[model samples]
Target chain A: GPLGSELESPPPPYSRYPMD
Target chain B: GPLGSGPLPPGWEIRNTATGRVYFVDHNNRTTQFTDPRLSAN
Candidate 1:
């Protein structure tokens, strides 16, 4: 469970997990 | 709900990694968390 290792967010169904 | 509740899923849990980071886990569900679910609360 690290940080800054993801592609901004998870893909697909979660591609909608937005941020600001 | 435009605004939902619960620690995410009643089965979901929040935990940390080996470092100063976060990752959600649901050992019984096998789901993973790679993004910050902050829209979460505030």
Candidate 2:
């Protein structure tokens, strides 16, 4: 669990795209 | 010493892959030895 921080979920799919 | 009484006290662990034994190093730096059946059975 020490490496738990590294296991953080990737950003939400839409968050990666620029807003319209 | 009894096992599974509770989560290992805050400390570092030294695991022996060959024996499936673990040594828990306490905050005070003392070491305790025990075998976790879940790990040793494997």
Candidate 3:
């Protein structure tokens, strides 16, 4: 599910500064 | 929880946007950009 990928903290790579 | 969101959403983020458009950044520095209106106010 698209939401499944969105659960918990998003992946560390997606955890970025000035995040989109 | 005072009802649950944690640590007081940090009293809103420190930015110069309009009063109604201010935001909250994760203090843990999570870098999450949240749009207003439907903010999870737990």
Best by TM-score: 1
- TM-score of every candidate: 0.40, 0.26, 0.24
Each candidate: how many clashes?
Answer: 0, 0, 1
Per-residue lDDT over B1-42 for candidate 1, one digit per residue giving the tens place of the 0 to 100 score = 132233565554555444534455544555556443544535
DockQ of each: 0.07, 0.01, 0.08
Clash number for candidate 2: 0
- DockQ, Cα level, model 3: 0.08
Candidate 1: tens digits of C-alpha lDDT, residues A1-20: 56555343432221222221
lDDT tens digits, residue span B1-42, model 2: 345545543453434323443333333444333343334333
Q: By the TM-score metric, which is better: model 1 or model 2?
A: 1
lDDT computed for candidate 3: 0.34
Name the regions of candidate 1 deviating beyond 4 angstroms: A1-20, B1-6, B36-42
Residue pairs with backbone overlap in model 2:
none
The lDDT of each candidate is 0.43, 0.35, 0.34
Model 3 alpha-carbon drift over 4 Å, by segment? A1-20, B1-8, B11-23, B36-38
Best by DockQ: 3
lDDT (Cα, 0-100) at A16 in candidate 2: 19
